[PDB]
Amino acid sequence: SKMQAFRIWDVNQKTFYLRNNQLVAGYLQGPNVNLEEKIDVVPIEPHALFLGIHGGKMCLSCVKSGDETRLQLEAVNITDLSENRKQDKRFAFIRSDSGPTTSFESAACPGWFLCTAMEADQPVSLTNMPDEGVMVTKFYFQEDE
Amino acid sequence: KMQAFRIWDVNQKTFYLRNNQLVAGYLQGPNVNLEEKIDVVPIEPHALFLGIHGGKMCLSCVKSGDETRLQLEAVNITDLSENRKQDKRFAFIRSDSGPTTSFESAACPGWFLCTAMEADQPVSLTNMPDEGVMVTKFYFQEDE
């Protein structure tokens, strides 16, 4: 259970980058390629994990705002989280591989998978309609190391 | 470099923009001026980039599982690169059959550029070009 660095891009080749402290998927080229966000990962045996950016300084979570289930980026240290604390569960994600791609399902909001839009520069989100082909839910997740 | 062509399908439909969505229909009267010529930057062997407006807008295929989508992105066709991972979505493979031509998505293999049998529908992509529902055969005339 320690911090690993991963590079991620969806099946349409979009990368993650921040815009107004929001995570968005898009195509970075040239000087802007330096905006690419690597994903910091702390494994939770056997198939879950905590996901973050900026050296695990900000972590991804699933939050329910009234009637909405939205992805959120919180200012918490990936290292303070615990697979055994009820409150940190909103940060857990289940990793599932199939072929050369990877999917991430929310542990606190099951049935919700991390996703990106087909159009560029849209924020990264969570959809509960994976196979219904509107949002992308498959990613190439590789250990940047 | 950029080569220009005129395109029209086997049913005589031409491409034109409608609410900035590439649609295919029959232009009449002063509307014939709405025809969109296709700009091409070939990629040896038989691959190529396709655009309109002097290469200022290029078509691409983006997928989501078992479904694909045809998009017109505001990118310069000259900035696209064949040795660039992300630009593959703009690549198309050309094939000719007799006097006709077909275009297959490199990013979404098995999906061909196609038109609806009826007029004024958006140009799209189809995974089944054989079972004739959508039209996938085109006349592609090099504007020389």
Tell me the three state secondary structure of residue A82.
coil
Torsion of CA B19, B20, B21, B23, to 10 degrees: 80
Asked if the C-beta of A98 comes within 8 angstroms of chain B's C-beta atoms, the answer is no
Token look-up 């990264």 returns A124
Given a contact cutoff of 8 angstroms between Cβ atoms, the answer to whether A16 and A39 are in contact is yes
- Which has the closest alpha carbon to B22: B9, B31, B32, B35? B35
C-alpha to C-alpha distance for A106 and A123, rounded to whole angstroms: 17
Omega within 30 of 0 (cis) for the link into B30: no
A134 vs B112: CA distance, rounded Å:
20
Beta strands at A22-26 and A39-44: parallel, antiparallel or unpaired: unpaired
- Could you tell me where the DSSP H helices lie in chain B? none
Q: How many CB atoms lie within 10 A of CB A140?
A: 13
Contacts of A122 in chain B (CB under 8 A): none
- Contact at 8 Å (CB) between B56 and A124? no
Is residue B64 less than 8 Å (CB to CB) from chain A? Answer: yes
- Cβ within 8 Å, pair A13-B65: no
Q: Is B33 helix (H, G, I), strand (E, B) or coil?
A: helix
Q: How far apart are the C-alpha atoms of A136 and A113, rounded to whole Å?
A: 9
Nearest chain B Cα to A15, which residue?
B86
Strand partners, B70: B61
Among the partner-chain residues B62, B66, B67, the one whose CB lies closest to the CB of A12 is B62
- Cβ distance of A118 and B65 shorter than 8 Å: no
Where is A73: in which H helix or E strand?
Answer: strand A68-74
Q: How many CB atoms lie within 10 A of CB A62?
A: 22
Per-residue DSSP letter, B123: P
Beta-carbon separation of A29 and B107 below 8 A: no
Residue B134 in contact with residue B126, Cβ under 8 Å? Answer: yes
Instruction: Kindly state the tokens that stand for A61.
Output: 């979570």
> For residue B119, how many C-alpha atoms fall within 13 Å in the half-sphere facing its CB?
10
Task: Name the residue facing A133 among B66, B71, B86 (closest C-beta).
Answer: B66
- Topology annotation, domain A1-145: Trefoil (Acidic Fibroblast Growth Factor, subunit A) (2.80.10)
Residue B9, both tokens = 């399908």
Distance CA(B23)–CA(A99), nearest Å, equals: 36
Correct CATH for B1-144 of 2.60.40.3080, 2.80.10.50, 3.30.420.40, 3.40.50.360: 2.80.10.50
Experimental method: X-ray
Given a contact cutoff of 8 angstroms between Cβ atoms, the answer to whether B60 and B74 are in contact is no
Q: In DSSP terms, which residues pair with A95 in a beta bridge?
A: A104
Q: Which residues of A touch B66 (CB under 8 A)?
A: 131, 133
Find the closest chain A residue to B107 by CA distance: A12
Domain coordinates in residue numbering, chain A: 1-145
Q: Mutating which of A8, A9, A12 best tests the B interface, going by the most B Cβ atoms within 10 A?
A: A12
Two structure tokens written together for B67: 């479904």
Assess A13–B contact: CB distance below 8 Å, yes or no: yes
> A117: nearest CA in chain B?
B64
Q: Report chain A residues whose CB lies below 8 A from the CB of B73.
A: 120
Q: Which residues of B touch A130 (CB under 8 A)?
A: 65
DSSP code for A38: P
Distance from CA of A25 to the nearest CA of B (A): 12
Task: Considering only CA atoms, give the Rg of chain A.
Answer: 14
Q: From start to end of B66-106, where are the E strands?
A: 67-73, 91-97, 100-105
B67/A12 Cβ within 8 A:
no
Chain A partners of B85 at a C-beta cutoff of 8 Å? Answer: 13
Dist. CA B80–CA B76, nearest whole Å: 7
Task: List phi, psi (to 5°) of B81.
Answer: -140, 140
